[PDB]
Amino acid sequence: GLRRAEQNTEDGMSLIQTAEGYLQETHEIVQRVRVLAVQAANGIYSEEDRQQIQVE
Amino acid sequence: LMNAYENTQASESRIRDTDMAEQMTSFTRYQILTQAATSMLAQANMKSQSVMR
Amino acid sequence: LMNAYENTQASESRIRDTDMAEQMTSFTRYQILTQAATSMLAQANMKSQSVMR
Amino acid sequence: LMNAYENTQASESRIRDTDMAEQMTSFTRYQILTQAATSMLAQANMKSQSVMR
Numbered sequence: 001g002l003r004r005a006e007q008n009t010e011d012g013m014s015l016i017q018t019a020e021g022y023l024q025e026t027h028e029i030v031q032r033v034r035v036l037a038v039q040a041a042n043g044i045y046s047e048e049d050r051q052q053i054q055v056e
Numbered sequence: 057l058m059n060a061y062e063n064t065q066a067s068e069s070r071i072r073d074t075d076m077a078e079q080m081t082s083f084t085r086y087q088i089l090t091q092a093a094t095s096m097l098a099q100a101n102m103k104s105q106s107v108m109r
Numbered sequence: 110l111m112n113a114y115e116n117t118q119a120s121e122s123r124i125r126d127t128d129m130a131e132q133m134t135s136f137t138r139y140q141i142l143t144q145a146a147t148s149m150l151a152q153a154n155m156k157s158q159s160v161m162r
Numbered sequence: 163l164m165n166a167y168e169n170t171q172a173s174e175s176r177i178r179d180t181d182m183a184e185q186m187t188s189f190t191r192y193q194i195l196t197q198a199a200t201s202m203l204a205q206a207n208m209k210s211q212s213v214m215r
Binding site for chain 4: 005006
Binding site: 010017018021025 | 059060063064071
């Protein structure tokens with residue numbers, strides 16, 4: 001059981017390790033929206049250019 | 057996908073792949089126990105010759 | 110095929126091939142019994158002369 | 163859990179596993195006692211033959 005308990009504990013971390021791996025890609029996306037929001041907030045763009053920002 | 061490829065491959069290895077070092081200890085234990093049991097059986101066969109005198 | 114070749118050979122051996130360790134006990138058993146039969150046979154031959162006195 | 167398994171395995175090892183070197187001492191003592199008793203058993207049978215003269 002203790003040997004069984006140990007093997008589960010690695011498997012528990014593998015599940016935990018993977019979900020954090022998926023959150024890694026999610027976080028990099030939200031920052032990319034954030035930087036594009038800075039450029040989109042500048043005053044020298046027109047409706048067409050900010051719409052192209054909204055496309056991405 | 058690469059991260060999940062890493063994390064899942066590690067997940068299966070800890071279930072399917074053996075411990076080479078940990079198994080050598082059990083491998084030697086059974087190799088020793090085999091020789092001990094082999095000799096005791098050889099002792100046991102000759103045990104019955106005592107009454108032949 | 111090879112996995113099938115192995116399992117067939119393993120399963121065939123259990124019926125055809127003998128256990129040398131297990132066979133030695135039987136071989137030892139009957140060889141001692143051979144001497145006990147040989148010993149008491151000579152006692153039986155000697156049994157008759159006790160009345161020749 | 164690795165710590166727990168290591169200590170527990172030794173906990174059970176001391177309880178169940180035999181002392182291989184110490185048990186050879188006991189085995190060799192009972193082996194000779196068997197030889198000694200057997201030879202005296204041969205003597206006890208021949209002892210009764212005395213008064214046939």
